[PDB]
């Protein structure tokens with residue numbers, strides 16, 4: 001059957017090259033500094049980092065929002 | 069000790085202990101369950117190798133250095149299809165962290181003593 005409204009194209013989620021490398025910072029010595037925050041929730045305790053948006057941080061696993 | 073490393077990682081993947089990937093390695097190191105890790109060299113990795121080495125050197129983990137990525141993929145054995153010889157499509161890998169509960173192996177004991185001494 002013919003249509004009038006054009007079909008709603010699916011969301012093409014873009015890829016990120018070496019997205020893991022954007023969490024920490026590179027130093028020549030044997031020390032670690034973490035850039036973004038980490039979710040203090042129960043299921044994701046100390047391994048899963050949080051999002052870094054333009055106005056608030058977010059974790060999707062437990063739906064935790066940290067507004068400014 | 070390379071054969072000890074390959075056997076212990078095969079046991080780890082059999083026992084569903086190890087993790088593979090930069091994201092998985094970071095998760096294991098942050099969860100403080102990591103025991104060993106591997107890293108490749110001579111690649112277009114300006115800050116990748118420095119980042120993972122600092123992660124590995126943060127607190128009490130063993131480091132293994134290798135050259136090639138697809139060879140490391142052969143070391144872990146993720147594409148064992150076409151068993152009658154060479155795997156048809158070898159995949160590459162750089163960072164693999166070994167967490168093992170079935171460490172009752174002479175290979176594990178030898179590599180642990182090698183890192184300790």
Ligand SMILES: [Zn+2]
Nearest residue numbers: 039041044059
């Ligand atoms: Zn969370």
